[PDB]
């Protein structure tokens, strides 16, 4: 499993647009791309896809705000946030 590729796929499924994978330095916010009900649901994907669970307020539209950006998050936050229930 390539992480990177896999929240990418996520990314543009929740935006319905690949211009998430051919530009991914794009600014998600600033382009209109996603809103809050879409990043609600990217959390939730993020969770169902990978057991990673980031919160609300641990979202910030300044720091998540391109696909690689995005990326770089989750892949630091992947250990300490991963969960496994029991």
Same mark, same amino acid.
Not at 11 to 40: H, R
């Given at each position: 499993? =390539?992480?990177?590729?896999? #929240?990418?796929?996520? +990314? &543009?499924?929740?935006?319905?647009? *690949? %211009?998430?994978?051919e ?8 382009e209109?791309?996603? =809103?809050?009900?879409?990043? #609600?649901?990217?959390? +939730? &994907?993020?969770?169902?896809?990978? *057991? %990673?669970?980031v919160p ?20 630091? +936050?992947?250990?300490?946030?991963h969960?496994?229930?029991h």
């Amino acid at each position: 499993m =390539d992480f990177k590729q896999e #929240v990418l796929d996520v +990314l &543009a499924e929740v935006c319905q647009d *690949d %211009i998430v994978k051919e530009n991914p330095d794009i600014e998600i916010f600033e382009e209109g791309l996603l =809103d809050a009900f879409g990043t #609600v649901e990217l959390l +939730l &994907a993020i969770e169902n896809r990978f *057991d %990673i669970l980031v919160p609300i307020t641990e979202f910030d539209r300044d720091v998540w705000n391109t696909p690689n950006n995005i990326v770089n998050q989750l892949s630091e +936050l992947k250990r300490s946030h991963h969960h496994h229930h029991h």
